[PDB]
Each structure stands twice: as structure tokens, then as C-alpha cells.
Design a protein around this ligand. Structure first.
Ligand SMILES: CCCCCCCC/C=C/CCCCCCCC(=O)OC[C@H](COP(=O)(O)OCCN)OC(=O)CCCCCCC/C=C/CCCCCCCC
Ligand SMILES: CCCCCCCC/C=C\CCCCCCCC(=O)OC[C@H](COP(=O)(O)OCCN)OC(=O)CCCCCCC/C=C/CCCCCCCC
Ligand SMILES: CCCCCCCC/C=C\CCCCCCCC(=O)OC[C@H](COP(=O)(O)OCCN)OC(=O)CCCCCCC/C=C\CCCCCCCC
Lengths: 78, 81
């Protein structure tokens, strides 16, 4: 079933985001990807967009108090 | 630690990509997001980029024999590629 799997993924994402090593690794990977294709071409000013957005997403996943809500927002749960 | 968690996430994504309802739902959500902020401004021609990339990503995850590789590519596991 896709809804239980989505809930598990969101739970894992929140747990993972509560670790600084995760944030550092994802930041370095995305900073690298911003300098090369495909992101270099599909996302202008990629590095600045990353610097601004990645903390927002980290906080978003560190604050969500309802996985089912997110999975419904994406269309995987009712 | 984060390596087992990353492998579990990749395994779940691989499992999900085999169901077509997942693909349709993700397409619907991303088409919605492409028409509004922030993606409307951060991704020029968002809808076309989506139409081109989503199938590639679906296939990439449907042809994955070992999650470790992805987790190694992002730096959460010390080996995999
Ligand atoms: C108005 C300047 C236009 C751009 C100028 C470029 C120079 C750099 C200026 C920096 C600021 C630029 C801000 C523009 C950001 C991009 C906005 C954008 O993406 O548009 C989309 C967005 C809609 O997207 P959604 O929210 O998803 O739709 C559903 C919501 N119901 O709509 C907007 O454009 C945002 C609002 C635009 C504000 C336009 C300003 C109008 C000014 C009229 C007043 C007259 C001038 C006042 C004095 C000017 C000062 C000297
Ligand atoms: C669709 C996200 C990426 C693929 C997800 C794969 C399924 C994994 C399980 C789901 C993980 C959690 C999903 C995260 C997205 C949830 C975002 C959300 O619900 O809120 C929308 C949020 C604003 O929230 P609110 O203002 O409170 O609500 C009003 C709605 N505008 O807006 C956004 O999220 C904008 C950013 C959307 C993410 C864009 C992801 C990048 C897509 C790029 C183009 C396509 C690439 C193809 C990727 C294929 C993925 C397998
Ligand atoms: C090989 C491809 C791998 C694809 C990834 C695998 C899927 C695994 C799941 C990944 C989860 C992705 C999470 C998506 C981001 C969720 C964004 C979010 O929810 O945060 C909300 C927050 C919005 O909030 P506000 O509107 O500002 O209002 C305040 C609300 N608190 O989001 C943001 O601000 C940032 C959104 C922009 C980032 C997306 C840009 C990515 C561009 C992709 C280019 C296409 C590449 C092709 C691949």
C-alpha cells in the first residue's frame, strides 16, 4: 500500500533531519549539483536558491506533526 | 544511523515507483506546484522540465538493484557505488 509507505518515508525524513550530519551531507551534495548539469541549467542562481531553501525544507520536515497530512497533500493518502 | 535510514527510504521509493497510481499522483501534485510559487519562479518552464524529468526519475528508481549506491552518492553511506 502506498499510504503506509509514504507515512514511513515522511517519518524517516523527520528522524533524519534531526541530525546535523544529514544536513551537512545534503547541503554539500546539492551545492555540488548546483555547479553541474542538470541543476545548473534547470535552476538559475542555483547556489543562492539552495542556500535559502534547504534550511526552509529542513525546518519544514522538523516541524510537521502529521505525516498523513503531507501524504494526502501529495495525493497518497485520504 | 543515517545509512540504514537512507537505504530504507530508497527501498521504499523503489517499491513505490512500481505502482502506477504513485506516478500519476506525483505528476498531479507537481503539475499543481509548477503553476504557483515558489516553483513557478525557481524553475523556468516548470511543466516542461517536469514532463521530461519525472519519467527519467521513475525509470532510474525502477532499475535500481542496490539502494546503497544512491546513499553513497549523497554521502550518507561509506560505500555503494
Ligand atoms: C514589480 C517589479 C517587477 C520585477 C522588477 C525586477 C527588478 C527587481 C525587483 C525585485 C522585486 C521583484 C518582485 C517580483 C517577484 C516575482 C513575482 C512573481 O513571481 O509573480 C507571481 C505572483 C503570483 O504567483 P502565485 O502567488 O503563485 O499566484 C496565486 C496567488 N493568488 O504574483 C506576483 O507577481 C507577486 C506580486 C507582484 C508585485 C508587483 C508590484 C506592483 C506595484 C504596483 C504599485 C506601483 C509602484 C509602487 C511604487 C514602486 C516603488 C518605486
Ligand atoms: C513531490 C516531492 C518530490 C517527490 C516526492 C516523492 C514521494 C516521497 C514521499 C513524499 C515526501 C514528502 C513530499 C514533500 C512535498 C510536500 C510539499 C507540500 O505538501 O507543501 C507544498 C509546499 C507549500 O506548502 P503549503 O504552503 O503549506 O501548502 C499550500 C500548497 N502550495 O510547496 C512546495 O512544496 C513547493 C516545492 C515542491 C517540491 C518540488 C520537488 C522538486 C520537483 C522538481 C521537478 C520534478 C522533478 C521530478 C522528481 C521526481 C520525484 C520522484
Ligand atoms: C534522482 C532524483 C532524486 C529525487 C528525490 C527523491 C525523492 C525523495 C523525497 C525528497 C523530498 C523532497 C522535499 C520537497 C521539498 C518540500 C518543500 C517544503 O515542504 O517546504 C516548504 C517550503 C515552502 O514554504 P513557503 O511557501 O515559503 O511558506 C512557508 C511554509 N512553511 O519550500 C521551500 O521554500 C523550498 C521549495 C523550493 C525547492 C525546490 C526546488 C527544486 C528544483 C528542482 C529542479 C529540477 C531537478 C530535476 C530532478
Amino acid at each position: 500500500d502506498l499510504c503506509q509507505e509514504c507515512e514511513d518515508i515522511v517519518h524517516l525524513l523527520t528522524k533524519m533531519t534531526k541530525e546535523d550530519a544529514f544536513q551537512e551531507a545534503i547541503r554539500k551534495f546539492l551545492e555540488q549539483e548546483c555547479d553541474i548539469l542538470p541543476l545548473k541549467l534547470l535552476v538559475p542562481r542555483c547556489r543562492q536558491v539552495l542556500d535559502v531553501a534547504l534550511p526552509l525544507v529542513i525546518d519544514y520536515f522538523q516541524s510537521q506533526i502529521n505525516p498523513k497530512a503531507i501524504c494526502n497533500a501529495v495525493g497518497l493518502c485520504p
